[PDB]
Amino acid sequence: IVGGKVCPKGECPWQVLLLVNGAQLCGGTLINTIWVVSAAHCFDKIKNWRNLIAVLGEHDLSEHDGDEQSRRVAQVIIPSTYVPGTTNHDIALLRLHQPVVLTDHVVPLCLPERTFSERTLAFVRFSLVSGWGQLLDRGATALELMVLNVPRVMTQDCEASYPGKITEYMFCAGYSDGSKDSCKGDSGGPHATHYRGTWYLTGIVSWGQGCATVGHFGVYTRVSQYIEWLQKLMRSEPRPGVLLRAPFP
Amino acid sequence: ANAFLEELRPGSLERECKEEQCSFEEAREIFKDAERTKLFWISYSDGDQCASSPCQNGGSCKDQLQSYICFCLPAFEGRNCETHKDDQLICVNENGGCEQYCSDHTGTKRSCRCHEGYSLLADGVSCTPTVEYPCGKIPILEK
Amino acid sequence: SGTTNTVAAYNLTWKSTNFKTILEWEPKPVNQVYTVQISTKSGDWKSKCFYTTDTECDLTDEIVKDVKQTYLARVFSYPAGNVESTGSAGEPLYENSPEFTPYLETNLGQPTIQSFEQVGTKVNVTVEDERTLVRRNNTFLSLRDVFGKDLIYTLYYWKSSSSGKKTAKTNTNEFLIDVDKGENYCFSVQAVIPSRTVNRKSTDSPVECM
Ligand SMILES: *C[C@@](*)(O)[C@H](CCCNC(N)=[NH2+])NC(=O)[C@H](Cc1ccccc1)NC(=O)[C@@H](Cc1ccccc1)NC(C)=O
Ligand SMILES: *[C@@H]1O[C@H](CO)[C@@H](O)[C@H](O[C@H]2OC[C@@H](O)[C@H](O[C@H]3OC[C@@H](O)[C@H](O)[C@H]3O)[C@H]2O)[C@H]1O
Ligand SMILES: *[C@@H]1O[C@@H](C)[C@@H](O)[C@@H](O)[C@@H]1O
Ligand SMILES: C[N+](C)(C)C
Ligand SMILES: C[N+](C)(C)C
Ligand SMILES: C[N+](C)(C)C
Ligand SMILES: C[N+](C)(C)C
Ligand SMILES: C[N+](C)(C)C
Ligand SMILES: C[N+](C)(C)C
Ligand SMILES: C[N+](C)(C)C
Ligand SMILES: C[N+](C)(C)C
Ligand SMILES: C[N+](C)(C)C
Ligand SMILES: C[N+](C)(C)C
Ligand SMILES: [Ca+2]
Ligand SMILES: [Ca+2]
Ligand SMILES: [Ca+2]
Ligand SMILES: [Ca+2]
Ligand SMILES: [Ca+2]
Ligand SMILES: [Ca+2]
Ligand SMILES: [Ca+2]
Ligand SMILES: [Ca+2]
Ligand SMILES: [Ca+2]
């Protein structure tokens, strides 16, 4: 996160940290005790699947304070339309090996109805984006969880930033004046939107040209397009395998 | 206005343009100067665009030059106060007034609904948690 | 464009007098209807004028919530009779309005001379302090209420018997001027916000004469 501030401990309680072999990989969003939403591109280069861990209740990576809960990731589910190294359909649904315990520091973010998301949440100007990713483009990652309020734009108003590159499965948010954005290592983390006292998942940190560049916006996976896909998967009979491709739509 | 022999008299703004309707020429005879006459005439000849009673629903009309403005009662808006504030109770209008989810229905009023872990209150629009850690709340701050 | 299902609005224009503020646009509804949204520069978008055949939208009630904010509006097009058909991303075609800052840009309406009163060589001329669309609690605020010291009035006056024009200016709604006895004077006024760069002056009031 570029140009943000520390998210005080427990104020981003749906944030997930993903680790591979103990090393920081990406963020994620808790949506119930067993299921985490992240970005498909986080998994493009994994070989050591058995060492993929999700941490809930995390805040400061330098110390375990006891509110962290760590879980092996039993399954990573990606859209059948996702292609590694390409931007479209940048979403993954992760099944944890054991449920987390909900506490003051571990709470799921609501997965909204699609209509509500398109008609109402999409027109809340600002939403929070968070993560332990880079504090500046190509710079250092963060030891304390960072958070930033970013304003959304409709794709017509983002087109000139990324001509022909924003699909219906994406949306833009951020500051074309620069200096504030999500960044590398924040992928999979929530773009969370508040409405009338409750927070909802509207985007997933996905990609951008650099970070906080003038004339550009951050690009987020448009979660409203995936609500039914995610809901059906969470109800489905589990299939074997760590990495699963599931038909989209 | 002109009646027989009146025009033997000096012009009078009160007699000819206020108590009567005056033509441009009659006004010209009063003010003499072309520019002064025009400045009078642009307003005098404009007409009252409120005469057609354009403001609806108890609004009040204020005439302007070649136009009017409607002051509406508090429940109304529109150029003519034609719009009532609660006449499109639909989900795209401030979420139908619903706290969480909203559904439009054919032939029925819209309904409000709540997410899992919440239930709808008797007011028909608000939601309250039914579990200890419902989604989308920050318990460390609401304690 | 018989293969398109909507076309974007254009020529979006703010019509605003005494804070009564109406957005207007083109084109006339041709197989489509419109919805407007308005926001402040950093605020949420509110929808107005839902699925309308109008090519106008009254936004007065929104802009008077803070006349010193800068507002953005946009006009969305929807296929007629099929208004939920807005494409895969849920984003209908739209166009953006110019920014609008009511305090700086609303036109001052044509003023009215309320009265004049002469004693010998002096005359009071009083301008009506008329209502605007801005509400405070349950009441409409006057021009003076809204603009305070930023508003002045200018007086154009003349003796019928002389070719010259005279002027005076006031920080209130009242002028006290000297006149020659035995002469009939006529008067017109304009409202002025000197600090503005655009729409600084109203049109002239109707002419009133002794
Ligand atoms: C994986 C995430 O951690 C990370 C988030 C970056 C968010 N940036 C922002 N400005 N808000 N995502 C990536 O690094 C992303 C991964 C990727 C996605 C699709 C195809 C290839 C790679 N890469 C970039 O964002 C990256 C590359 C890029 C450039 C232009 C268009 C698409 C992808 N950007 C770089 C390098 O600047
Ligand atoms: C008499 O009533 C009818 C409705 O029955 C109105 O249509 C008339 O007003 C119309 O014609 C006169 C125009 O002056 C007026 O438009 C002007 O005033 C209102 C402003 O909102 C507008 O911008 C301006 O052009 C028009 O609405 C009414 O006189
Ligand atoms: C004019 O103003 C409107 C708002 C109403 O109060 C009317 O009764 C009045 O005459
Ligand atoms: C892993 N840790 C000991 C650095 C917290
Ligand atoms: C590793 N631990 C944080 C789960 C204790
Ligand atoms: C992380 N875990 C394997 C101990 C559960
Ligand atoms: C007004 N809008 C919700 C249809 C975009
Ligand atoms: C946080 N905010 C000031 C950008 C709204
Ligand atoms: C104005 N700027 C966005 C080009 C810097
Ligand atoms: C003078 N007036 C037409 C504005 C009432
Ligand atoms: C018109 N006035 C004399 C009441 C001020
Ligand atoms: C803005 N105002 C205080 C001058 C009225
Ligand atoms: C009353 N005043 C006109 C002298 C200000
Ligand atoms: Ca820690
Ligand atoms: Ca006569
Ligand atoms: Ca006559
Ligand atoms: Ca005459
Ligand atoms: Ca008569
Ligand atoms: Ca008389
Ligand atoms: Ca004559
Ligand atoms: Ca003559
Ligand atoms: Ca008129």
Query: Could you state, in order of their start, the residue ranges of all structural domains in chain C?
Result: 2-105, 106-210
Please state the φ and ψ torsions of residue C118, each to the nearest 5 degrees. -110, 135
Query: Cβ–Cβ contacts within 10 Å for residue C41, how many?
Result: 12
Name the closest residue on chain C to residue A124, using Cα atoms: C44
- Structure-token pair, residue A44: 């493009």
The amino acid occupying position A1 is I
Sign for the CA dihedral angle at B23, B28, B31, B35 comes to: positive
Contact C187, C125 (CB under 8 A): yes
Please give the Cα distance from A182 to A26 (Å, whole number). 12
Q: What angle, 0 to 180 degrees and rounded to 10, lies between the N-to-C axes of helices B24-31 and B34-44? A: 140
Q: CB pairs under 8 A, 24+ apart, for C23-26?
A: C23/C56, C23/C57, C23/C59, C23/C73, C23/C75, C23/C97, C24/C55, C24/C56, C25/C55, C25/C56, C25/C75, C25/C95, C26/C55
Contact A11, B138 (CB under 8 A): yes
Please give the Cα distance from B117 to C194 (Å, whole number). 59
Ligand 13 atom closest to residue C175's alpha carbon, by position in its atom list? 3
- B28, B83, B86, B93: best mutation site toward chain C, by most C Cβ within 10 Å? B83
Topology adopted by domain A13-108+225-238: Thrombin, subunit H (2.40.10)
Question: Quick check: A222 and C89 CB within 8 A?
Answer: yes
Question: Quick check: B100 and A32 CB within 8 A?
Answer: no
| Segment 104-123 of chain B within 8 Å of chain A by CB | 115
Task: Please tell me if residue B132 touches chain A, with a CB cutoff of 8 Å.
Answer: yes
Please give the Cα distance from B137 to B131 (Å, whole number). 11
Spell out which residues of chain C touch residue B62, defining contact as CB-CB under 8 Å: 18, 109, 130-131
Residues of chain A with CATH 2.40.10.10: 1-12+109-224, 13-108+225-238
Q: How far is the CA of C165 from the centre of ligand 17 (A)?
A: 24
- C2-105 belongs to CATH 2.60.40.10: yes
> How far from chain centre, in Å, is Cα B52?
15
Please give the Cα distance from A54 to A96 (Å, whole number). 8
**Whole-Å CA distances, A189 to A115, A171, A180:** 22, 15, 16
Q: Which residues contact B137 (CB under 8 A, 6 or more apart)?
A: A107, A197, A198, A199, B129
Binding site per annotation, positions of A for substrate: 181
Q: Which ligand is nearest to the CA of A92?
A: 1
Please give the Cα distance from A198 to B99 (Å, whole number). 9
Q: Which residue, A182, A111, A103, is CA-closest to A145? A: A182
Q: Is C147 in the pocket of ligand 12 (CB under 6 A)?
A: yes
Sign for the CA dihedral angle at C168, C172, C178, C181 comes to: positive
- Structure-token pair, residue C141: 């605020």
User: From which experimental method does this structure derive?
Assistant: X-ray
Contact A14, A202 (CB under 8 A): no
- Structure-token pair, residue B65: 């030059």
Domain A1-12+109-224 homologous superfamily, CATH = Trypsin-like serine proteases (2.40.10.10)
Has A41 been annotated as catalytic?
yes
Q: Which ligand is nearest to the CA of A207?
A: 1
Contact A52, A46 (CB under 8 A): yes
Please give the Cα distance from A41 to A219 (Å, whole number). 13
The amino acid occupying position C37 is Q
The amino acid occupying position A102 is L
Has A177 been annotated as catalytic?
no
Has A157 been annotated as catalytic?
no
Ligand 5, atom 2, lies closest to the CA of: A70
